[PDB]
Structure 1
Amino acid sequence: MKNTGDEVVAIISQNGKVIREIPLTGHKGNEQFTIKGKGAQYNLMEVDGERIRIKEDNSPDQVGVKMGWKSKAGDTIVCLPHKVFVEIKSTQKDSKDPDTDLIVPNLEHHHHHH
């Protein structure tokens, strides 16, 4: 029913930096969030019943759409046309290789008004 001890979280990174991470295990019900990156390039992600998938995105690959419901430590969601890379890791000592070679803080080229 709802006794799940394998507490895993989905790590969302884009362009080469971690932008968000959603807990899957125990996270019952439905949840949605839109990953906006470059020119018109976005990924509408959906977490429904302790599992995550790409609900909709504008890519000719649609790889994450083929991936479907992912929810275990080791599952991934990859949309290179949008530079979105997602991997699922567990909270309980799930020691994955932490490659920290990320992209520098991107400047908002319009800082003065919207």
Structure 2
Amino acid sequence: GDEVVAIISQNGKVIREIPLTGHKGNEQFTIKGKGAQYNLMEVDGERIRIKEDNSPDQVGVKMGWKSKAGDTIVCLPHKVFVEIKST
């Protein structure tokens, strides 16, 4: 099948590029913003989501798990973006 990488950015600056294909186990990391802003990122197997955050709108959290080429997650107030790209 497809081989994909998740690109996770904050204010356009890349924090992690994470190849998802073949990934097993669970990893969590927090992107800390200005003030008390945070996003708890979670990679579980070949999927990624914002597990939890204190954004006012919760749009990115509500988007849930992503895993396919072309998928995105956005948390606009915290300037966090996830893009999944085919390699």
- Normalised TM-score (structure 1): 0.70
**8 A contact 1:12–1:84 mirrored in 2:** yes
State the Cα distance separating 1:55 from its structure 2 match.
0.9
How far 1:16 sits from its partner (Å)?
Answer: 2.3
- Report the counterpart of residue 80 of structure 1 in structure 2: 76
Q: Is the 8 A contact 1:9 1:21 kept in 2?
A: yes
CA displacement, residues 48-75 of structure 1 (integer Å, 9 cap, x when unaligned): 1210011110012111211111001100
CA distance in 2, matches of 1:83, 1:41: 10
The structure 1 segments of at least 4 consecutive aligned residues displaced by more than 6 Å after TM superposition are: none
1:85 positional shift:
1.1
In structure 1, distance between residues paired with 2:21 and 2:58: 25
Q: Larger relative CO (CA 8 A, sep 6+): 1 or 2?
A: 2
Relative to structure 2, which stretch is displaced further, 16-25 or 53-62? 16-25
Asked if the contact 1:46/1:52 (under 8 Å) is kept, the reply is: yes
Return the TM-score normalized by structure 2: 0.90
User: Which structure has the bigger radius of gyration?
Assistant: 1
> Hey, what does 1:69 align to over in structure 2?
65
Give CA-to-partner distance per residue, 1:5-59, whole Å, 9 cap, x none: 4210110111121121112111012111111121111110001121001111001
Sequence identity of aligned pairs in percent? 100
Aligned-pair Cα RMSD in Å: 1.1
The structure whose residues are more often strand, as a share, is 2
Q: How far apart in 2 are the matches of 1:53 and 1:71?
A: 9
